[model samples]
Target: AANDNNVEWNGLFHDQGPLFDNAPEPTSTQSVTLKLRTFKGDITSANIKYWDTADNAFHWVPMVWDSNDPTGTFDYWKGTIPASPSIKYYRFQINDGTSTAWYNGNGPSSTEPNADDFYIIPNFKTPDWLKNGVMYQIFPDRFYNGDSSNDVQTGSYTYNGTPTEKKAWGSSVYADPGYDNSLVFFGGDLAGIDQKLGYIKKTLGANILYLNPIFKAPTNHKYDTQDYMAVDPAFGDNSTLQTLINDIHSTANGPKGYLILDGVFNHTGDSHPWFDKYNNFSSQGAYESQSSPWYNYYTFYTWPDSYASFLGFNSLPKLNYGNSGSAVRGVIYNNSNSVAKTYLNPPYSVDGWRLNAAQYVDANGNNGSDVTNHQIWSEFRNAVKGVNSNAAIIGQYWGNANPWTAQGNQWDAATNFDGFTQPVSEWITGKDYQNNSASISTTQFDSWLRGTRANYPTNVQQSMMNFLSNHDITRFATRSGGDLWKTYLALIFQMTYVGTPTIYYGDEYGMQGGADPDNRRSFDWSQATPSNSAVALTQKLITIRNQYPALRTGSFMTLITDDTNKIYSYGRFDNVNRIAVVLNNDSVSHTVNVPVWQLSMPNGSTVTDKITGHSYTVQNGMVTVAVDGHYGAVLAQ
Candidate 1:
């Protein structure tokens, strides 16, 4: 029964039963001292290799253990998970030269079916705008409609509200629910966004803007795409989108323009030509469709009785990956047809792509056929790189992206919680000045940073996109309780971290709103008037992040942590520069002690405070950093 307990699941787990201890979650930032007990079973070299659902299979990250001696004779073997990571299944293997043995440890005792478990890490990415650059996520229609001319009316008549586009979709009936108004057209087009780009840029001094699904789709959300090549008519077509992209680029005195489009390839609309024929054979009346060139593109069962689709969206049909019709196994990273002909070529121009619902893109349970798995990502990356070598492929993974690390070469970078709206706005601001005891301190915070950076290889970390508030969460000003100071700390960390930071649309001017429509509140250009005091703070943070190259690409190392004061501290280093950050999470004023050795600089040496523009000289490599209760500070060299 012990050996029978092992059963392989997906490369990752999702909190099923207790094959592995699912409590007291450990974080990459703080070295988790696992209080684990080992039964010390009799194991030999024959079974030295072990595999589990939680472990990453893409890259070759060797397994290591800490023993009393190097002879591998110790009862207890310990090692650390990568920084900014969380372990789901505790797996290990022993090799006795001639052979190797692999086993999954459930409470330190080898167990079965223990192989099928995984844990999800919290989001931890913080890109460039995260520090000095402010972000504001905008939903095209909700943000603003400068010109209503491009809004498409529902009168065009192709497929009506109750179109007969339906079939069996994944264990359920994929019935056509007709067109919901929410899924209909909105006036928000590329021009609408373009008209407000200046105002958005001015708020946080940001150059990058992440746009949600803009592809041709049947609905307002646009995630259910009908075609990748055609821009949604509501979004002003491809030409309009491209023109806005080129027109907003940075000038000598202005900010550079950066754009990241949403890549949604998981499923296509039922109205999509592929689904209309392949799944609902009789719906579109194109009998030749079955014999057409793209006939085999939809995923389905033997027909009539059984049909399959993603989740349960009848309108969204799954693609038949096996069919030769779609050689491009992965999602479309960019316009494949317009490779060298377009300006978005890699290694030189255009930004990256953000994958939607990436966790589900690759399916589990089924071997080989499950496109949601890492191999699918690898296939996609191969195709993507073929066109643009420099283009980035970012994924939308809220949990730990460890499985994707070497998995068919996952994404170039990911979005973390550090800079995104949730933590910085609610989590950080809620505790910042209240009971200093409850707030997230700098050291405590930077520890998260350290772990986040440690999880990926060098390139993945630098290419990551950070943000403050996106279209899905609460706004910064609203969560900060009307105080702007709370956001400053977020900005400082974004620049100092290892990844590339992103700026949400409205954060710079202290944008405030709640989720969905609230989070997508229109940009207020009127606020640009000279009397608007909020603009000053945003400008300062942006200037700091933009001016510092070390912040964009630098080394993150811990400086100190006052366990008693609940204070956390760390330093950032580049070839010729160094910066330090200190946070006091305690209730009372923290007279945190800074050790001379920690500074490493000579006594009486002066260091400049980038956040406050003040400089201080160190006394014996030590400086008394007075972090006001929950407030934080940053000093740059």
Candidate 2:
């Protein structure tokens, strides 16, 4: 229940303002209404619309209002509150009926202070998925070693693929098989990815694929980029990637689709040509030369009175954003030249770009010029819109990205770290969704997700990426004290939730590792050979997510989230279909009563459980939901 209320913003400065501190929560019923009354300047009537957080769209429901004194109550407007969507934020616009004007409360605003967008408070509910889509994180290389021919490197590494030994190519003890505790890396290229795309598509209903940095890099992990143009040679070239995308697109028959790859722009490898100023600068290296055009691309430091090295390491060189007219940054900012325009524009089409460490990419480090600066999303989106307009640009910033009536800065989306995954884990496996497994009250997880929802806008909430674990941290399975079943529930919630869902490559097969190097393990091709339980679970959830439009794009409604049962039930409703999801975090099996309207069902028809594929009889006013401990169900009508 979030964003359902009569929020009071000053009528005089009524240019689509943000929500006040706290507002009423939404319920799974038709009569839920939001009425507003202000005491300042106004016209005869106002246009009202509700934010469809699930689909990231706004719906203009029917409205009726009564003037208080023949003048205007500033007044009260009432309409059937649509089902709460399982999304990140909810927005409402006024005077949206007109055309040409952006301030009429219709579209989103770009600039702050004088923003042309409308705003609202987020009384958020956890997305629909946390109750149903339990997630799994995969670390490719370490998951399974199906082929030895692809074992290209061997060494002990810390978080990233940093070699511990001081030796070169082949002679270090780190290369010896048994000496390193670090996860191993085999040739887990795009062909390997192609072979397993079916497994991923079939499992977790993966609409979005969150793979680690695949750009050509020197290290095994590939984060330190050596080249940006070519797909890593070990990962196979452009042809293989194109074929894989074609295969996935050709197969989707339902609401599901696939989104792939990451856009890594933070820094480049030590050997990149831009940093090799072999000819112009020093004839030794580019960073040390002044005359070289690429010379200003790096940040050099003087230590002990002598010119020393690159930024953090001599290998990962930072691009000098200070250089006024550098071609490297220019190409990146220029969508046509940067890898985004090239890859997204060609036969190897991708859904969108996950701007890497997006916060640091700015030219001037200031955010106002963000729209003009390649570092800011405004600039990033400009190039992206040219390449593929529907393509979403998910930023890696940590919090709400909306400027919110100029009270905040701008960011498109943030990676939802603990909001969805950890919180769900708290209820099912241990008590709270974090690392600890102690049993706490069931409402703990709900409280956590609700708070997270309120912090972001509905579009961000719905589109915000959710994950239990990725290539960046320890696997959710290992980190959650090894409760695979509870982890399974969390994964289910991610796929079923309203936003575009993303899965770190090997999560379906339960791939395990900590931090970077271990996180980027090569793909395990043999897991799909017919008997993997993990593979089976992933396929089931994927089917559930893809089969229903309500699950994919319905408004979220919290049916139940309270003390005793730690039980949480939510609903997602679109134009023709409606979906209801219920979760239980208690120790014993329990059956909770869901009122008929709360289920958002049409008259005289029964609802079917998408996960279990069973029909539940809903006669007059109620339905009893029987769910297992630390588990949930998805209902569609």
Candidate 3:
């Protein structure tokens, strides 16, 4: 009945945009008001119902008729959500005398919305750079080989008794399941990425550089950290990381670059001096003796052999932070000399951190679920903010990141798997990130995007990390069966979508790979055809995204979801410009009518497609354009 449009139904809408949530980020219990919109003279009354975490009860605040819209068809209602130090959850209740409706982050509902209520995060906000910039997530071991002298010599080291092997760049990645992949190295290091700053900043136009990990580790993918204090000699030394970061910060390269390094705080390598399964360190480890200085840092079921690990991986031992004021907290991020703090300050000054397997950080072998996750992150937030209030703390969550991002105190945002990558991956390639054969209609795709986005605050949504593929998943280009056009289409959407567009290394040139070790292949260099059209399109998209603040932090409105024709059209707009993207998902060109009136475009205005320089005239609030298969037209006035 709610979906029925035959009867005269009143229109109501609200979102956490600047127009609605005027007081975006309040540090204290500052006075604030939230605005809502409804059809003029349609609703009998309106009110704001919010959940107060402190009182553990719902409270109602009356909404007053604020003003009429420019079109005079809508009336604005204003309500104040009284502040507390805690975060607030609120929704609108509209009553047209008899019939009633509710609205929250999921939009209008006949009944009360679920836990998807809009958020009012106090004292929490994403960094300014995160919202305005694009990120390039680089896997250090795969990008480029800048210094041959520092190369990890084949058979020079043994990982778990297996001799490490070096592979040629762009060669196939193969390993016998378990620890072999860790023993394989491609010799890519910090110097490699350092040498490509010009390409990253000037060519690709990505201002933020997100490195997987540069710390001392045995594996090519440095998740299992050996030493937090030093950079891996195989990659480079501590000085190399700092110099690269400083170079990234140089404005002469591009739009003032920033660095983000992987934070593997959840677990440590078995070879780490703290755990030391192998007798390589001078100081005894927890595995060797109970009298070890770092014995309590890791959880051990028995004296030596039995210990709790991450997902039962013996190589990766879980951290067991004891009660409050534990020694581990100071070592991780709490103290001024901590690993997290060290980078934010001195010459290493990384702009942010992407917490690896963030949800599992906790104490005593049990997961952080024992209220430990919240407390640890709450403390982690204060620690990072205390050092550099502008630095970002992002989490790696494959599911809804609302819980961590809701309070605005923990993570600035997440890698945006559930929000951007998964849905976009399926919509574009008809395959999920896992390389699973999956598909979704444009209608379902739009709903998926909105539902996932509704999970976070507007500011957090703007800062989400969006990418088609990453080191942990199958390459998107491979998923499309090497459809370069599909990658082109994905780039257009990624650059124009909500959240910071993150290019996962060689994905710009349509690198192909499978799962696990395969997805972590070395950059193909010019062999991957850097002169391809996909690369040019990616560069163009990046330029477009950087030029338009509206595309970076604008309101998204679905204009058309033509599932029949496989056409998806949406408007990303603000006061500055109205940009409508019309995408043709089918394998052939199709002329579609994109409704621009929804974005407040004039009836006879001329819109220019920034990509192809094609112009279209708007008539009856709609513009007709022929969108190529696997491509989109970005029409902006």
Candidate 4:
């Protein structure tokens, strides 16, 4: 299929193909010029069809052909439109007298195109550091415990009738028949994270650190925010966080490392000072008095006991953003002392926020009001960016983040759910390990990836936070049935794919668990030795990624993908050099012969595997290599 498609591949229309003036990000009020190359005299007419958001109509502009060219017959086309606030979808229609085709996000198609299929983003910009850097996500309580004095003690508190208890180091957590797992805490804290910065920066080659919620809360995970502006005593004080930020930005130790904090604005802990359901703090709460200032922040059905909560959880009361001049909205976005802007503009200057459950933040359990979520998120984006333009606001949406990522003035990028992570997991593990997931063949995986990449704006794609396993799900190794080699295949693909790669804490050291509390195990510092195979493999992959500029900043193209043999090959290339990555998912050795010239490889050129330094020669415009079962090769010229 690649051979047949290679002949008709019009490099001009390709997103990363070839161009005279390549402008990937165009702002509103600016028009861009584009060019395309086709077979000599193969087209009789060409037109650019674009969707105008103002009228919701499709419009076309004619393309002019060039008869004289140096290489071959080529068609040059130009389309200009003032940048607008909304996304503008466009495609190319070509008629070569005998055949008609439409060029959209998914290469060339003969069927009618939908507006959602292809588009361009105007007036959107993501930080450059986030676009190219690798990110490391840390679940604060489980990462490390730098300070022993702040550890939570047993019988200190109770959650859902279950007393809180701290687990010892090197302990594993699993849910019992009837027990509250969230009440169990491991003593990991900010001090522990600060001590391991060198390991993350130098050993893992990661520049960005994403921390789960550190705000004061009752539960270990802290998704239920009790105080937006105060750091949890269990983790550390504000001064501890400030020290970490100072170290990250210090002139001697730092180049450009960033700190991304997690924000749970959708709801607050029922025992929070504003709610005062437990009478813990000395303040009048909404549940305590009708005359309280925070009374209008939450919706009530029957006085106090029948209030609306997040997804019907009484412990997590939802905030009401629709109420005019509500305290919750003022604390989150409007006021100068708002929670989102506080740390972003101080001695504790956090880089940005990873908003939790972003799609449902402003919905308030109400249906038919999706627009409110966008408007609220846009305001949140403005509030954060206003403090620091370089800050990145990445949302966490479980599925189909297209509607949120496609718009402007909302989010810089989102956690790669619909775009990545999940699809790749299904392919390598053969199931979701938590849901009713079925087997997905290599062909279907390829198609899913293509569609996802096409749906997102090119700029957004570059900044997406791509990961394999996170705190919310089962670990990748456990999902793959503990086949270490198969997990390596997934890692190789993650490091080579588009967007910024994120490594979950302890994954490099071969940590495996199932489901939530189990998946949220503490980092095992004991097993992080030189003899660990997973650590060595992970370090090798990150080393290769960090060593190549083409791998960090380049265009992606599929060279060969065979479903029958379970082998897939792809490349990331620029004008100067190209990196070819071949993967064999089969249980036995497999040989793949790929047409190198189609990927812009010169005849008789030699390529070396960056991982193994093994050499391969190209003959007759094709290169054949044998890859061991459950392994991959990263080759480059």
Best by TM-score: 3
Question: Which wins on lDDT, candidate 1 or candidate 3?
Answer: 3
Model 3 per-residue lDDT tens digits across residues 212-318:
98899888887889998899998889888888988899987777988998999999999999989988898899898899999999998886888988888999999
Q: Write the per-residue lDDT of candidate 1 for residues 1-637, one digit (tens) a residue.
A: 0122232221111111111122223344543222111212222211112233345542223433323211222223333334444333334444433433333322122233343222323232223332233333456654456556666554543443432221111111122256443444435668877877766666456666677877776666677776776777767777777776775565542576666677666656666655553333444411234555454555445542234456656566555455322443523432354321133553224555677766665332122224445666666666555655545577776655646643325566676654233334434575322112234544445445544544554445566666766766666666777665555555555545555555565565666776554465545656654355456655665577566655655544466756666666666544455567776555567766565334244567767767677777777557666677655666766
- lDDT (C-alpha, whole model) for all candidates: 0.51, 0.51, 0.85, 0.76
lDDT, ranked from best to worst: 3, 4, 2, 1
Runs in model 4 with CA error above 4 Å?
1-13, 16-21, 37-45, 64-86, 159-161, 175-179, 323-325, 363-369, 433-437
User: CA shift at 82, candidate 1, in angstroms?
Assistant: 23
Candidate rank order under TM-score: 3, 4, 2, 1
Better of 1 and 3 by TM-score: 3
Which pairs clash inside model 3?
none
Residue range 234-286, candidate 2, lDDT tens digits: 56566766875676566553224445456766567665666652222234455
Steric clashes per prediction: 45, 46, 0, 2
lDDT leader:
3
State model 3's lDDT. Answer: 0.85
lDDT of 1: 0.51
Off by over 4 Å in 1: 1-138, 152-181, 184-186, 200-203, 250-253, 277-295, 301-307, 323-349, 362-372, 418-448, 474-484, 512-518, 527-535, 562-566, 584-599, 625-630
